[PDB]
C-alpha cells in the first residue's frame, strides 16, 4: 500500500528511491511481499549509511521502516597489525557527504 | 510537631513595599513615570490597545511602566490583581485575560467574533500599519531620538549597554518587517533578514497609505460614528492604538527635503479625515478629561 | 548603517520559478504575477525568464525587469503597482493584505512544514528547476523561510488533525464570500486581487501531496473555490501553460542566459559562504546592502556611495580569531636558552 | 566553559594573568566572563556578561589580599512560572560598577576539616559611588570568623568547632556624597541565607523575607554555628570520615523605611537620615527574638579537593514561611558553616 | 591565498557540511 522510511535524515531521496520504488512493483500473496521487503531492507544495509541495530519494519492495516543514521565524523588512533609489529595511525572518516559517499584520511 | 516556635514573617524589603503595594489592579505597560501617574495612553500600540479596551470596560485600574521581561508571557501588557496579604499575591493575568478579568453593563461588545469581512479588514491593521510603524520607528534615522528616549534611555543609563539594547531592538524589528510580504520577502541563507537592507521601505510605505485609505472608506459607510456599531469595540481600539500614536509621535510638521509625507499627516488626511475624527472621538470616551493631544 | 534607511545624494521580463506542479510556476506570488501579466499585456510584451533568488539583484523572485528604464521591481504588489464604488478597491486592498498573510502560512503548512509533502512533492519540484549544484542550497533556504512564516499557527510536523482542519477553515471561511470569479454574486473585488487569490488557492489544492488534508478540506467544504480554480486554470493556462511566452525555447531554455558554469559556481560559493558562522553572518549583511544599493541605483535614485564597515567587521572577526588561535597555538620563538650563565663582577 | 546539571548553563572567562614586578605572589588578572545561571529559590535567571580586573597579593605570613574592579550587566530574564510581584518589580537591567577587597587570614590545620586552627575572612564592596558609575549604589560588608579546638582524648580528634558570619548592605547616593537620596536594594544584591552550606536544615534558599514560594533576600544578616566533630566511635583517628554534631542559627532582615511619611511620592528615594534609621532598626530587629535553630548528626568525608556531608537535621525554630527541611540534608562544597 | 582559503574551505565544508539531504519521514505510494 504505502511504505515510509523514518529516521533517514541525511540520506538523499533518489537513493532510497532507487531502492524502494521497485518494492511497490509487486501488484494477497503476502509471502512475496515479505520477501521483497526483506530483500530491500537487506540491500539497504550493504551501504554504510546507517547502523544495523534498529532496522525495524512494522506492518499494519502499511509498511514502516525505521533507520538511524550512523554518524558524520569519526576519529580514531587505534593500532594497525598490517604484517608489522605495530603502527600508530589517525583515521578520520566522513561517513556520508551527499548520498552514500565517504572520505577517509589515514 | 517538629518546629517549636513561629515568629511573625520577615517583612519584605522596601522596594517590595513602594512598588507592589497597590490598592487597585495594576496594568504594566510601556509608559513613562511622568505619564503613568495620570493614566495617559502608553507609547506602545500593543499596550495601548489593551489599555483602551480596559478603559472602555469601566474598570478601575492603575498603570505602571515595565520592561517586557517581567511578564507571565513574552510580551508586556499584563495585569496584576491587588495584593491580599502582605506576603502573597494572586497570579498575574496575561494580555489575553484582561477582558475576562474586567468582569458592568455588557462586556460583550469588547470581545466578539468579527464578521468575515471585518476579519479581512483587520489584517490591514495588524500587518500593514504594524509594519509601517515598525519601519518608521526602529529603522528611520530621523526618529533615533524618539527610539532612544522611549525604549533605551530609561532602561540602563549606561552607554555600553544602551548601545546593545538599541542594536537588539533594531534587529528584532527588522526581523519582523522582513517577513510580511508587503515590503520584504527576500530569500538569503538559512537565517532571517535581520537588517534594513532587506525590508525595502517604499513598498511598506505604499501599503500603509493604501491601508489607511481602505480603513477610511470602511468607516465612511457606518452611519453610527464607529465601525458599524454604537459603542467602540475591539476593532475601534485596535485602530486607535495605531492612529493615536502615529498622530502623536510621527507628525513632524523636513518633509519637503525628503518627500514621503510622514505617517501622522497620512492619518490626518486619509480620505476625508474620518480617521482623525475617529481618534478624537475615542479621546473623549476613554480619556474624557485629558487635553493636550495632537502633538 | 546596515539598520537604517539608505542615504541619498543632494518589453518587460518577468523572473519566476519553474512550472513544477502542472501550473506555470510555484511560489504562488510568482504564479499570480504570471496570471496577471498573461491577462493584461499580450504575448508580445513579456518574456517570462525562469530564475531563482540568486540570479536577481532583488533577491525576491516575482521580479520584473523593465527594459526601457532598466528598473528592477520585486514582489507581486510592487509589480502590479507598476504596469498601471470605492468599496471595490477597499475590498481589493483588504483581501490582498489578508491573502499575503493568513493564507501564505496556510499554504506553507502543507508542502513545506510537513516533511511528508516536502521531499515527496515539493523538494523534487524545486530541484527540477535549478542548475545542478544549487538544489543543495536554495530549497533548504526557501523551506526555512516558509517555515518561519508558517509559525504563529502553533503547528509543526505533527488526534492533531482537527486542529489543522480548524486552522484551514478559519481562513477559507473568510475567503469563501468574495465571489472570486463571476459577473454576479457577492463582493466583486478586482482583477489584480483575483489573480493572487488564484495563485494561492491553486497552489493549495492542486499538488499531489502524499498527505493531502488541505485538498480534502477545500474539495469537501468549499466547492466554490475549487470551481473557481479549475475554471481560471482552464481559461488562462490551457495545456499546462506552455503557450506562455517563455524565453527562447520554453521553461528549461530560460535558465540559460544566466546559468553558465561560472555564474552558477559564484551562486553556489556565495550561498555556502553565507553559512560560516560569523564571517558568513556579516558577509550576508554586506552582500544584501550592496545588492539593495544596486537595485536602488537602477530604480533611478543616487544612494550613498558605500560603507564597507560591514565587510571590514566580518574580515576583522575572522582574521582576529585565526590570528589569536595561531599566535596562542604556535606562539613566538623561545624566550630563553638551554644554558644561562651568571657570574659575579669584579 | 563550565555547564552544570542543575543551575548553571554557561561560562566563558579567559582569565589572562601575569606577575607584577617580577614578584611571584603579587599577580594581576583581566577576566571577561559571560555566564547564565539559574536561581530557582527566587524563580528567575541571571545573565552576567561583564569583565573585571583583579590584583591579588599573597603576603608572606600566609595571609592573602585582593582588590578587584568589576563591571557586569546582570539581566533577569527567566520569569516563566508564577513567581512574585517582587521578582517582577526587579525585572532586570543593571551595570553595577564596583570595587571589592577581600582579606583571607587562614590558619586552619586542614582546609576541609579544621581541628586545631582558626580562620578570619572579610569581604567589602563599594558599588557605584563617585567615580564608579552604574545603576546601583551600595557599600556591602561581609565578615567571617571560625575556629576549631581539641580538648582531650596520641591525637584523637574531638575538635569542638565554631563559626560566625555577619553582613550589612548600605545604600548610598550616586555621586561624591555621603548624604543624598539613595535607592533601596534590588533582588540582585541582597543576601541569601540558608541551605546545605550556610545554615543546614533549610531549603537552598530559606531564612528570609518571602513573597510566597519565592526567596527575596535581605540587607542585614547574621549567622552562627557550633560543632562537635567527634571521631569515628571506638576506632580512633582514622581516615577523613568523621562524625559531626552541630547546632546552628540564622537571621536575615530587610531594610524598610516605615519611619518617615514625608517621602510619600517617589518611594524609591530615601534621604540619608531615613536610611540610617532603617539600618539601625534592622540591626535592632536582628537582635531581639531567638533567631533560628537546627540540629543533627552528619557524616563528614574530608576529600582533598572537596567536602561531603550527607546530614540529617530537624529545624527547631523558624519564621512563618522559611521552608525548613528535614530529609537527609545532602551537602557538598568548599565553604561550610 | 589559494592554499590558505582552500584549506579552510575544505575544512569547513567537511566539518559543518551542507544542509541535510533527506527528511525525517519519506513516503512512497503505488500509482494507479
Numbering used by the authors:
A (entry chain E): 47 to 73, 78 to 111, 127 to 171
B (entry chain A): 26 to 128, 139 to 262, 264 to 289, 292 to 333
C (entry chain C): -32 to -23, 2 to 75, 105 to 178, 237 to 424
D (entry chain B): 172 to 324, 329 to 512
E (entry chain F): 393 to 424
Question: Would you copy out the relevant sentences from the publication that reported this structure?
Answer:
In addition to using lipid nanodiscs, we determined the SAM complex structure in the detergent GDN using cryoEM. In this sample, 3D reconstructions exhibited several conformations, with monomer and multiple dimer conformations present (here, the term monomer refers to the SAM complex, with one copy each of Sam50, Sam35, and Sam37; the dimer refers to two SAM complexes). All of the dimers appear to be non-physiological, with an up-down association of SAM complexes not anticipated from functional studies. However, we were able to determine a structure of the dimer with the most homogeneous conformation (dimer 1) at 3.2 Å resolution from 117,339 particles. The SAM complex monomer determined from lipid nanodiscs was fitted into half of dimer 1, revealing that they are in an almost identical conformation. With these considerations in mind, we note that in dimer 1 as previously discussed, the Sam50 β-barrel is partially closed. Therefore, we performed particle symmetry expansion in dimer 1, focused on only half of the dimer, and proceeded to refine this monomer to a final resolution of 3.0 Å, resulting in more clearly resolved side chain densities.
The SAM complex facilitates outer membrane β-barrel precursor protein folding and insertion into the outer membrane. The SAM complex consists of one copy each of Sam50, which spans the mitochondrial outer membrane, and Sam35 and Sam37, which sit on the cytosolic side of the membrane. Sam50 forms a 16-stranded β-barrel which is minimally closed between strands β1 and β16. The structures of Sam35 and Sam37 reveal that they each adopt a GST-like fold, which is also completely different from the BAM lipoproteins.
